[PDB]
């Protein structure tokens, strides 16, 4: 399947022209026969790519319904519904109870469902991004005569002709070309035009001049070439197939949740069967033991949980959007908090993807211009007389012009018409000099000899602006060696000086050096033409050297470089502090890639690749211990050859890696290599060449503006801003929530125990049911909701960036220490709080607790209007029921009172309420007040007696759980203190989340 696509291509550029036909069954001059073109059409198929096999029906809604969690709620709803159906066996109360519960469950799955399904309904789309560019016709030669045919018709063997402007229809072997240039950015990510000639330039097929690739567009010139490959078979076609057809998989948060549901179920079963068996030994048939087991579901399963996690995830995502960080998926909020390594594309990601100027040599000194977009750097030199003279030639001996109508946009940002080197000079001068146009105007261009291929140099003759001369000035530029050949003198400072052999090499030095920077160099000189020889009028001949070309005054040298985005070197540093490995992966050449690597902080001071050391040592490389090199830079042509085990070692071996000149399949390979290690890898990229890797990465991040549609589709996240620094914020939004979520789990779970125990005691003790099904739903659906959600607001107890990424396998979101804490300790304190209120209401009523035992049959007995309390009085069915209902209400309230404590304690794992300040979280405090207020409402509001069987509570009743609440706050607070004091041992080991 996909695996073959990962391998690099193998070709036929070495083959002779004649040989290629022989293989093809084609005629070079004439082209395939019509008959023969058809055949081959059927044999092979169309010259069309296999439509994006990506279409997940709107039926996908149904995917949010199931999950693992929603299941737990489904099975639970289904168990309720069964129970009901079993309660069909007689005339039952469940019309309010069991059917109501099972419907509530289903409804929480559905709602939660919907909600999820929306926050996600915003994304996807990839094939349609690719299709956004989708051939039309081709001109082919068949039977000696050319015609334009539907592009699908093209087959291997035929003759195709392409000119400047057209898109290469298929993979082609160039047989004939005049002055043709192509754009191969689809392959390389690099736009500058590449020659196409008939002779094979290199071994690599991607490199050779003789091949023109589909998904590429002939920039200029004209060519012809034989179709080697069609449709899926072309180099890019393979890339296409090798993309959308990807299985998205599970997120870590999603995994953590799944892993939660297992534990929870784990308990809900264990207990639920245990209560089948314990009820058996008591006096309960298969009729009754069974109804309990299923009964044991709701108490066990937090109905409110799914909702809370989502609103928590949604709430956090909102903060990030505020951040100019859009998140397509809710699950995406967390993932960032577990990125070990980042594989970053260089151009347009790390860098602005915007050529510029470099340095300068003059005054026998090397100068360094500011390359930055914002031009944050400083001013190298205004002073020098030489500098101006040099500026003059740069502005004057220059064709380029800025496009009209962006005086709005900044100089380095505006589009210029002209070659890159000439634009670089214009921008340079326009920035430090003032308007270029100015200078042009002021020194009108008489005549000039455009940059020839043979001359390797471009000159101009201008009337001098200085009104006292307006004599003629000669300015030229071109290959540095050529400009020197052409000079007698050198403008050092203001004044000319003989060009001795000493300067000849000081120049030769600079030229070498700048040229080592991986910069392109140009030489500059000018000549104040003798006015005797040239009259004001004087006519210049561009055709034949009227005027002097040799013995000119050599002004200076102009180099260039490349830069990144402002934020990026930092953002990189932050990530590294984060203990994240950053790995460059770029299509670009190695000299450039390494330079940027240094610039950004991918490669740190001191680091060294074998070859650097190599070179400082003065020693051959074989000689150099590999292990001495922390850093590595590997060309794609070398990476091709290597095994994936060899890749794994390189990866194991080096802290700072740069893969340069990599193909899209190689980027993919690196990532996979990364993942094999078992690290979580963010790929950040801008280009179509980044697609398979972005699509591979645990999280693909794409640039919003620069980014090609392809990258955007392929990605999980879009940096709308192209603000790399965002990536840092994104990683800091994947750790504060993960923890805050456990707090909300512990909070929600703790109340489960106060809900469970009353039903159990009810069976074991044979006492009147202390809490009802309805009462439970008010806690889970009403009261616990705000407080649970509110936990998301919680802050860091420590500097979170400082700790290492979580080992996904070892540190789970919900762990046994949470259960023990929620269930074993805190929940248990909660339950007694509830039970107490129970006893107080009945006792006050005339039913002392000792009398309570064994009573439920009489109490429940509908027939007995007679039930005698301890005092000796007699209560009807309804009467004592009202009291019981009051109990259900008070128990409900007792939990909310104990939930206040739980809320407080839950706010911090390590820290003391005092340190944190339970106080700052406004959302949480709001939870206590609204929570209470909901309870009071349920109690006080009239009609709530019938609708939810909630009865009014005396003021006294409110207090019962108070000592319980307070003990919880103390008991936890103590414990944490203990945990701070000895980090090493026991409390932390058992209890620490």
């Amino acid at each position: 399947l996909e695996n073959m696509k990962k391998e690099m291509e193998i070709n036929d550029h070495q083959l002779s022209v004649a040989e290629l036909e022989q293989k093809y069954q084609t005629s070079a001059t004439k082209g395939l026969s019509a008959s023969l073109a058809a055949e081959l059409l059927l044999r092979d198929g169309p010259n069309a790519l296999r439509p994006p096999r990506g279409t997940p029906e709107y039926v996908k809604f149904a995917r949010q319904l199931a999950g693992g969690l929603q299941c737990l709620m489904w099975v639970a709803a289904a168990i309720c519904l069964i129970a009901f159906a079993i309660q069909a066996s007689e005339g039952d109360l469940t019309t309010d109870d069991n059917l109501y519960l099972a419907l509530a469950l289903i409804a929480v799955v559905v709602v939660t469902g919907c909600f999820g399904y929306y926050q996600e309904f915003k994304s996807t789309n990839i094939i349609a991004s690719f299709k956004n560019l989708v051939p039309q016709q081709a001109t082919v030669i068949r039977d000696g005569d050319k015609f334009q045919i539907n592009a699908d018709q093209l087959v291997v063997g035929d003759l195709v002709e392409m000119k400047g402007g057209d898109r290469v229809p298929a993979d082609i072997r160039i047989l004939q070309a005049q002055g043709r240039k192509v754009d191969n950015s689809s392959l390389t990510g690099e736009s500058e035009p590449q020659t196409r000639s008939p002779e094979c330039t290199h071994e690599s097929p991607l490199e050779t001049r003789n091949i023109a690739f589909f998904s590429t567009m002939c920039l200029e010139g004209t060519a012809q070439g034989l179709v080697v490959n069609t449709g899926d078979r072309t180099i890019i076609g393979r890339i296409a197939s090798l993309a959308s057809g990807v299985e998205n998989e599970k997120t870590p948060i999603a995994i953590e949740i799944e892993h939660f549901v297992d534990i929870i179920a784990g308990l809900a079963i264990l207990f639920g069967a245990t209560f089948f068996i314990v009820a058996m030994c008591i006096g309960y048939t298969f009729l009754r033991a069974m109804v309990f087991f299923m009964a044991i579901v709701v108490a066990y399963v937090p109905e409110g949980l799914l909702a809370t996690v989502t609103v928590c995830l949604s709430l956090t995502a909102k903060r990030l959007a505020s951040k100019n960080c859009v998140v397509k998926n809710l699950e995406a909020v967390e993932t960032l908090g577990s990125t070990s390594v980042i594989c970053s594309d260089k151009t347009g990601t790390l860098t602005q993807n915007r050529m510029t100027v470099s340095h300068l040599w003059f005054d026998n000194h090397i100068h360094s211009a500011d390359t930055t977009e914002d031009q944050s750097g400083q001013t190298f030199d205004q002073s020098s007389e030489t500098w101006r003279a040099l500026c003059r030639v740069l502005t004057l001996c220059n064709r380029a012009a800025f496009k009209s109508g962006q005086d709005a946009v900044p100089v380095p940002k505006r589009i210029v018409i002209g070659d890159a080197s000439e634009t670089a000079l214009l921008k340079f001068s326009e920035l430090t000099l003032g308007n270029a146009m100015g200078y042009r105007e002021r020194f009108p261009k008489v005549c000039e000899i455009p940059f020839n291929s043979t001359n390797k140099f471009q000159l101009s003759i201008h009337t001098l602006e200085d009104p006292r001369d307006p004599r003629h000035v000669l300015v030229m530029k071109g290959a540095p060696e050529r400009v020197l050949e052409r000079c007698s003198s050198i403008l050092i400072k203001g004044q000319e000086l003989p060009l001795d052999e000493q300067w000849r090499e000081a120049f030769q030095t600079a030229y070498l050096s700048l040229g080592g920077l991986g910069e392109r160099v140009l030489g500059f000189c000018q000549l104040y033409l003798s006015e005797k020889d040239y009259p004001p009028g004087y006519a210049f001949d561009v055709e034949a050297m009227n005027f002097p070309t040799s013995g000119l005054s050599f002004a200076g040298l102009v180099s260039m470089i490349d830069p990144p985005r402002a934020t990026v070197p930092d953002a990189v540093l932050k990530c590294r502090t984060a203990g994240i490995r950053v790995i460059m992966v770029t299509g670009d050449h190695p000299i450039t890639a390494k330079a940027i690597a240094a610039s950004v902080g991918i490669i740190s001071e001191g680091s060294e690749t074998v070859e650097d050391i190599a070179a400082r040592l003065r020693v051959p490389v074989d000689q150099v211990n590999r292990k001495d090199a922390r850093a590595c830079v590997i060309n794609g042509m070398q990476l091709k050859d290597m095994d994936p085990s060899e890749l794994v070692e390189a990866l194991r071996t080096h802290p700072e890696m740069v893969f340069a000149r990599t193909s899209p399949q190689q980027k993919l390979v690196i990532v996979e290599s990364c993942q094999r290690l078992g690290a979580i890898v963010a790929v950040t990229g801008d280009g179509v060449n980044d697609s398979p890797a972005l699509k591979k990465a645990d999280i693909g991040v794409a640039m919003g503006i620069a980014g090609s549609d392809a990258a955007k589709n392929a990605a999980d996240m879009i940096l709308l801003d192209d603000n790399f620094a965002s990536i840092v914020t994104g990683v800091e939004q994947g750790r504060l929530i993960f923890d805050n979520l456990k707090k909300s789990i512990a909070y929600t779970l703790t109340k489960n125990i106060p809900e469970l125990t009353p039903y159990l005691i009810y069976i074991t003790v044979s006492v009147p049911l202390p809490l009802g099904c309805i009462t439970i739903l008010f806690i889970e659906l009403c009261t616990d909701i705000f407080p649970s959600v509110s936990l998301a607001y919680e802050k860091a107890e420590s500097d979170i960036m400082h700790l290492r990424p979580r080992n996904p396998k070892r540190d789970r979101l919900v762990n046994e220490p949470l259960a023990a804490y929620s269930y074993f300790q805190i929940g248990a304190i909660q339950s007694f709080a509830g039970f107490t209120d129970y006893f107080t209401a009945m006792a006050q009523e005339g039913w002392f607790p000792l009398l309570c035992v064994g009573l439920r049959p009489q109490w429940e007995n509908h027939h007995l209007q007679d039930l005698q309390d301890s005092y000796g009085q007699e209560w009807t069915f309804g009467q004592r029921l009202y009291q019981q209902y009051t109990c259900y209400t008070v128990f409900f309230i007792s939990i909310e009172m104990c939930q206040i404590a739980d809320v407080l304690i839950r706010k911090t794992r390590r820290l003391s309420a005092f340190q944190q300040g339970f106080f700052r979280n406004r959302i949480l405090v709001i939870a206590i007040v609204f929570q209470v207020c909901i309870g009071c409402f349920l109690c006080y509001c009239p009609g709530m007696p019938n609708i939810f069987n909630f009865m009014p509570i005396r003021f006294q009743w409110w207090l019962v759980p108070m000592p319980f609440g307070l003990l919880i706050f103390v008991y936890d607070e103590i414990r944490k203190l203990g945990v701070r004091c000895c980090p090493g041992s026991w409390w932390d080991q058992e209890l620490y989340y």
Partner: protein, 175 residues
């Protein structure tokens, strides 16, 4: 799952649940202190008396007549047991649900309490304290009947405790 260290668990809970079954019981035995032996803190629940019946759906003592309320004194132990007054076509018997210190107030179909007893003193105060027919023409059919009690003190809750101050039963007598 530890090695060795279960002590530091097993001994833990021992004197921590211990501490917690010990505070809880702590809080109960305190509550219990602040209640009368003879009278509950709230009477409100029982507020209107309900009516219940025998059916299923002395001497010592004092001789008495049909009069006003007999006050025994306060509800205190300083006196010994307060003295209580003496007392086909089925026979159903109705009583009024005992409520301490409550003085009831008084000073077609198909075919079909003396004040001297109150106030009831309550069990602890009075142990053997006794609280105070369908001759019908039809036979061999279910008959729905409702018996109720009257007073200014008495109230009925038709929507709720159908018991409250009233009965509802279906008699049948198959001869």
């Amino acid at each position: 799952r530890t090695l060795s260290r279960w002590v530091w668990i097993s001994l833990y809970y021992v004197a921590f649940y211990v501490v917690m079954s010990g505070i809880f019981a702590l809080c109960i035995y305190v509550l219990m202190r602040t209640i009368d032996p003879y009278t509950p803190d709230y009477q409100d629940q029982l507020k209107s008396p309900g009516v219940t019946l025998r059916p299923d759906v002395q001497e010592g003592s004092i001789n008495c007549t049909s009069e006003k309320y007999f006050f025994q004194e306060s509800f205190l132990a300083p006196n010994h047991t307060k003295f209580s007054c003496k007392f086909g076509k089925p026979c159903f018997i109705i009583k009024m649900n005992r409520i301490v210190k409550f003085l009831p107030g008084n000073s077609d179909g198909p075919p079909l309490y003396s004040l001297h007893y109150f106030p009831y003193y309550g069990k602890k105060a009075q142990p053997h304290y006794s609280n105070p027919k369908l001759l019908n023409v039809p036979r061999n059919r279910d008959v729905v009947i409702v018996c109720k009690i009257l007073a200014e003190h008495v109230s009925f809750d038709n929507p709720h405790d159908p018991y409250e101050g009233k009965v509802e039963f279906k008699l049948k007598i198959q001869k």
